[PDB]
Structure 1
Amino acid sequence: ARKALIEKAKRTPKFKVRAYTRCVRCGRARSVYRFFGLCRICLRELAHKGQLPGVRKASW
């Protein structure tokens, strides 16, 4: 996303309903995992390099 936008996300005050979570890697507003604070593309990205602790691709 844009800069003024990736900022305003963090300026959280004024009517706490407005705070929306955002990716702390991207700026990406959509599909941001509460847990990691990452967006879905970055979670796939970091998890692949191993840089996500105890996070391994599953199967069954």
Structure 2
Amino acid sequence: AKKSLKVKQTRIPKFAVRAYTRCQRCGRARAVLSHFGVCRLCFRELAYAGAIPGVKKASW
């Protein structure tokens, strides 16, 4: 039961507090980056391929 949860999340609920944010590529619910709308483990593939502009490795 993932796709239906994804579809239900896309559909608007009847209460505002009923709305949660899921990853947009896959369907992972937890550990979703609101800054990108992408979960933590999809961010690796996008960051490691150059799809996301400006995302370089950090050295501090």
Structure 1 and Structure 2 fold alike (TM over 0.5)? yes
- Structure 2 partner of 1:11: 11
1:29 aligned partner, one-letter code = A
CA separation in 2, counterparts of 1:37 and 1:25? 9
- Structure 2 partner of 1:34: 34
Matched-pair identity in %: 65
User: Which segments of 5 or more consecutive residues in structure 1 lack a partner in the other structure?
Assistant: none
For normalisation by structure 1, the TM-score amounts to: 0.91
User: Which segments of 5 or more consecutive residues in structure 2 lack a partner in the other structure?
Assistant: none
1:9 aligned partner, one-letter code = Q
Deviation at 1:45, TM superposition (A): 1.1
Q: Count residues with an aligned counterpart.
A: 60
- Structure 1 partner of 2:20: 20
- Structure 1 partner of 2:51: 51
For normalisation by structure 2, the TM-score amounts to: 0.91
CA separation in 2, counterparts of 1:42 and 1:28? 10
- Aligned CA-pair RMSD: 1.1
1:23 aligned partner, one-letter code = C
Extract structure 1 runs of 4+ deviating beyond 3 A.
Answer: none
